[PDB]
């Protein structure tokens, strides 16, 4: 019932998680700057 | 050990076992750099 | 509620589905970077 809102918390934990996977994203976009400068 | 959510560590000190999930954990960098300037190149970047 | 656990999981199968995207075309670079050497 409710708890599952919780596990709904978890999932939104796992959302920042995502974030972090964005920022990784970031990170690989920075990396294909990198060789276009190369 | 890869099972579930969680992952069974072992202690680079002590190596003893220590059980934690895998969505609460915080990983580093490799050796090529160290003592920055400014944190804007933790091409990794974490609190930790 | 109820129904956005779905929604939930398809966006998180997309994300790591984009997750193995980044992991090749990362490995792509890494080639890349190589041949620049």
Same mark, same amino acid.
């Given at each position: 019932?409710?708890?599952?809102?919780?596990?709904?918390?978890?999932?939104?934990?796992?959302?920042?998680?995502?974030?972090?996977?964005?920022?990784?994203? $970031?990170?690989?976009? $920075?990396? $294909?700057?990198?060789?276009?400068?190369? | 050990?890869?099972?579930?959510?969680?992952?069974?560590?072992?202690? %680079?000190?002590?190596?003893? *076992?220590?059980?934690?999930?895998?969505?609460?954990? %915080? *990983?580093?960098?490799?050796? *090529?750099?160290?003592?920055?300037?400014?944190?804007?190149?933790?091409?990794?970047?974490?609190?930790?």
């Amino acid at each position: 019932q409710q708890f599952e809102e919780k596990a709904a918390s978890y999932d939104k934990l796992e959302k920042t998680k995502n974030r972090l996977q964005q920022e990784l994203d $970031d990170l690989v976009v $920075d990396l $294909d700057n990198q060789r276009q400068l190369v | 050990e890869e099972k579930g959510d969680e992952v069974t560590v072992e202690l %680079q000190e002590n190596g003893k *076992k220590v059980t934690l999930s895998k969505d609460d954990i %915080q *990983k580093m960098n490799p050796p *090529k750099f160290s003592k920055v300037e400014d944190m804007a190149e933790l091409t990794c970047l974490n609190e930790a």
